[PDB]
């Protein structure tokens, strides 16, 4: 795996074109990424620091109190992030929140920097294609790698009637965000998401 960048500045004032310099060199990535879940990754550059993010998952054969196997199947999964040091070398990478989900949420990732506020917060989300009631898993972090504190309260509080689980504020928010990308799609239909 490799990364590179392109400037949108460096045009000639006369030119509908950019200097060759605008293209960066292609650069190798050192993280042992082969554990990646689904051949998927997202870069983020913020505050002049580059980051790389993805997730991984494996199924575990859980069993009932009755000793028998819980045949529904469940999936240990975890969010992974790394960053480049000022010295020009890749972090060893790290894991954020873990989960053992009752289902194989696996339809890739969404990531952005947020300025709905001044902290310039880091956020990551993952999804599963219930075309309605789309299922989401997500995490949010302070740039000092601290899980972000404040959030708006759940749009779907626990026990909104018999949907007793509701959602956690965190994932409720992330879900809104991804909906703001794959349902709110005037910018481009969700079929375009892959590109």
């Amino acid at each position: 795996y490799f990364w590179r960048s392109l400037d949108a500045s460096q045009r000639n004032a006369n030119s509908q074109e950019l200097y060759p310099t605008a293209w960066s060199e292609w650069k190798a990535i050192s993280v042992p990424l082969e554990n990646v879940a689904n051949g998927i990754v997202r870069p983020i550059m913020m505050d002049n620091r580059l980051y790389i993010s993805w997730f991984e998952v494996a199924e575990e054969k859980e069993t009932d109190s009755d000793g028998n196997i819980i045949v529904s199947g469940r999936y240990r999964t975890k969010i992974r992030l790394a960053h480049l040091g000022f010295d020009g070398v890749w972090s060893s990478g790290t894991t954020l929140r873990e989960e053992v989900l009752a289902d194989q949420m696996e339809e890739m990732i969404a990531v952005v920097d947020r300025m709905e506020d001044e902290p310039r917060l880091a956020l990551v989300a993952f999804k599963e294609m219930s075309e309605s009631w789309d299922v989401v898993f997500s995490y949010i972090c302070d740039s000092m790698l601290i899980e972000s504190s404040n959030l708006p309260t759940t749009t779907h509080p626990p026990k909104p009637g018999d949907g007793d689980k509701g959602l956690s504020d965190l994932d409720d928010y992330g879900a809104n965000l991804v909906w703001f990308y794959l349902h709110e799609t005037a910018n481009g239909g969700k079929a375009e998401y892959k590109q």
Binding site: S30, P32, E34, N35, A58, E59, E60, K61, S92
Partner: protein
């Protein structure tokens, strides 16, 4: 790298499941670094 990548896959089937040696890729990466050092050091000799 490819060796560890391959060994990521699960090993066991039937009434039990046994996954794979989770740390193998990271261990390989460490050794890869060491191997790089090994080559570099060896080169210096020829120049000298």
């Amino acid at each position: 790298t490819a060796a560890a990548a391959l060994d990521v896959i699960p090993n066991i089937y039937g009434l039990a499941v046994g996954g794979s040696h989770w740390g193998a890729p990271l261990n390989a990466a460490a050794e890869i670094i060491m191997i790089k050092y090994q080559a570099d050091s060896s080169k210096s000799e020829s120049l000298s």
